[PDB]
Ligand binder design. Structure first.
Ligand SMILES: *CC(=O)N1CCN(Cc2cccc3c(CCNC(C)=O)c[nH]c23)CC1
Ligand SMILES: *CC(=O)N1CCN(Cc2cccc3c(CCNC(C)=O)c[nH]c23)CC1
Lengths: 304, 304
C-alpha cells in the first residue's frame, strides 16, 4: 500500500537523449533510429526569438551546422527538415539503444512522465498531467527544451510531449513528436494566453478511489448525487463536467471498492462545498487531479 | 522555473534489477558486479514469517535453490551468505550494466529516489525522504521487496535503501545495502512501533526558499525570530529543532534570495501558528518537508 506521484522508469528514454547545438544555442534532442528530433527554435538566437521566420532561419543552416552529441560521441548529420515546430536531423547511425516506441498525441487530462534534461544529460524524472488548457505545470530551466514526456506500456515507449517554452506565467508549453503544439501556443517570445484551466474531475474521483483502497476513508458520506446535480457543483468550482464516458472509465475502481461512482461524486461534492476542514487525503491538503483512473489501477495492482 | 517532486533518472538502477526466487517466494534483487543483493526473507514462507530463525532457514538452502533471473537470462549462483538482513548471492557473471556505485547509509531527513519493482521488472520511480523516525512513506505492494532507494551524483549511484516491509500502519521499513535496518525494525511479522515522527524543519525552510525563487512569496512577512524562539514553536508543532548546522546548510539559498535564514524562520513560524488560510505554496496546501536544501539548489540551478 501507499500512494505516490510515480513516474515511469526513465531508462529507455535516457538512452535516446542527445545534445543538439546550432550556432550558440544548445538544447536536447531525442535520437530514435537514424533521426534526432528537437525543437526548431534550436536555430534561433535571442535576437530572433521575438518574431522568428523559421523557414528563412533554417535556410541559412546546413547539416554541418547541427552539432549532435550523444554523451561523448558525435553524430554525423546527413539530412535536416522542419515538420511543424520540430526539426528532424537524419544521422548516419541508428541509435543502438532505441526502444520500441510510438509517437502519440495525448488528450487533455491524461498523464505522462517527463525526463528533464540539460545538454543531453538527464537530470530528473517527474509525473505531469496535460492540463485541460493544454499547458503542463513542469519544472524546466533554460536548456531543458527538447526534454520529452512519455508513457511506457511494458516494452513500448509512447512519446507524447517535447518541451518548447515557458509562458510568462511560469507554466509550460510544448508539442507532440510531430511538432504540433498542444494548445494555442506558438514558438515565439510573445505574450500568450493560456486558457482558463479546470480541475480534471475524473482524476480527482480516481484519486478518491485510491484513497479508499489505501485506507483514507474519512471523506466517504451517506449521500449520493446525479450527474446533473454533480455538474452544477463542478461548474461552480471550475471542475470539468463529468460525462458517462468518465463514469465508465471509473467502472473498475467502482467495482473493486464497491462504491458507486455517483456516491463517490457525492463525497467529492461535499469536499468541494466544505473544504477538507484541515484534514488530508493521501498526504495531500488539496484535491489531487494528476492521477488518471488508469494510473490508480496500475499503482494499486502492481503493473510493470 | 516550476517546482516538482523530482526523482533521479532510474536507468542506471533498472540495469541492476533481477528477480530472485527461493522456493515459492519471489522478490527483487540488485545485481552489482558478481553479487546479487536481496532481502533475506526471500528464504521464508508465510508459515515462517511470524518468528523466523533465519540462520536455520538459510541452512536448508543451497546455491541451486536461489533462482536469479535478469530479465530472461538465468544467473548461475556460486555462493550465498547472509549479512545482517540481506542475502548476497555470488553469481558467475559480473553485471555488464553495473554503474559506478557506492553503498551509503543515509541520515534521517535526507531524500532519495525509489525504483519500485515487481518480479525484477521496474514499474515506477518516485522521490522519498527517510523520515526522522526511520520509516519511509512509499508506494509498495507485495512483491516490491528488494526494490532499492538511491541518489545519483553525475555517474555514481549511491544505494542507500532496500525495501523489506510494510508496518501494520502502512508506512515502510527497510535496510541500508549492508542489511542493517533503518530504525528499530526487525524483519518479522510482528507489531512494530514506528517512533513519533517529526517534520523535517530544514527541508520545509529549503522548500520555502524554492517557493520564493519560483515566485510564490505571499508568506514572506516583516518579522524575524531567533533559533530559541523558533524552536519553542517547532516543539509545539512537532518540527525538528533547528540547529546552526541547519542554518549553515541553508546559507547558499539565503545568499541567492537575500532572505536571512531567521527571517525565513519567522515566515515559517507564522505559517505554523496561522495555517495557510486556504492558499497554496508551490501547488501544495501543506508545508512540504521532502526536499532537502541540496535538492532545491539542484532543481533550481539545473544539475545533471
Ligand atoms: C526550454 C528552453 O531551453 N528555453 C530557452 C529558449 N527559449 C526560447 C523560446 C522558444 C519558444 C518560445 C519562447 C518564449 C515565449 C514567451 N515566454 C516568456 C517567458 O516570455 C520565450 N522564449 C522562447 C525557450 C525556453
Ligand atoms: C515487500 C514485500 O514483497 N512483502 C511481501 C513479504 N513480506 C514478508 C515480511 C518480511 C519482513 C517483515 C514483515 C512483516 C512485518 C509486519 N507487517 C504487517 C503489515 O503486519 C510482515 N510481513 C513481513 C514483506 C512485504
Amino acid at each position: 500500500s501507499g500512494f505516490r506521484k510515480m513516474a515511469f522508469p526513465s531508462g529507455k528514454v535516457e538512452g535516446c537523449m542527445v545534445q543538439v547545438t546550432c550556432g550558440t544555442t544548445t538544447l536536447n534532442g531525442l535520437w530514435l533510429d537514424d533521426v534526432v528530433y528537437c525543437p526548431r527554435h534550436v536555430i534561433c538566437t535571442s535576437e530572433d526569438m521575438l518574431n522568428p521566420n523559421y523557414e528563412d532561419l533554417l535556410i541559412r543552416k546546413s547539416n554541418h551546422n547541427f552539432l549532435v552529441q550523444a554523451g561523448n560521441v558525435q553524430l554525423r548529420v546527413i539530412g535536416h527538415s522542419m515538420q511543424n515546430c520540430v526539426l528532424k536531423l537524419k544521422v548516419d547511425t541508428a541509435n543502438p539503444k532505441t526502444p520500441k516506441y510510438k509517437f502519440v498525441r495525448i488528450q487533455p487530462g491524461q498523464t505522462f512522465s517527463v525526463l528533464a534534461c540539460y545538454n543531453g544529460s538527464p537530470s530528473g524524472v517527474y509525473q505531469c498531467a496535460m492540463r485541460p488548457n493544454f499547458t503542463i505545470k513542469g519544472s524546466f530551466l533554460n536548456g531543458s527544451c527538447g526534454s520529452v514526456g512519455f508513457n511506457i506500456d511494458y516494452d513500448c515507449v509512447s512519446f507524447c510531449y517535447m518541451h518548447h517554452m515557458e509562458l510568462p506565467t511560469g507554466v509550460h508549453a510544448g508539442t507532440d513528436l510531430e511538432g504540433n503544439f498542444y494548445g494555442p501556443f506558438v514558438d515565439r517570445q510573445t505574450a500568450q494566453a493560456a486558457g482558463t484551466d479546470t480541475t480534471i474531475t475524473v482524476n480527482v474521483l480516481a484519486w478518491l478511489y485510491a484513497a479508499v483502497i489505501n485506507g483514507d476513508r474519512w471523506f466517504l458520506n451517506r449521500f449520493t448525487t446525479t450527474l446533473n446535480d454533480f455538474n452544477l457543483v463542478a461548474m461552480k468550482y471550475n471542475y470539468e463536467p463529468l460525462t458517462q464516458d468518465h463514469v465508465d472509465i471509473l467502472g473498475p475502481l467502482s467495482a473493486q471498492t464497491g462504491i458507486a461512482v455517483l456516491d463517490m461524486c457525492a463525497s467529492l461534492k461535499e469536499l468541494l462545498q466544505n473544504g477538507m476542514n484541515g484534514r488530508t487525503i493521501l498526504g495531500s491538503a488539496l484535491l489531487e487531479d494528476e492521477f488518471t483512473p488508469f494510473d490508480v489501477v496500475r499503482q494499486c495492482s502492481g503493473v510493470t
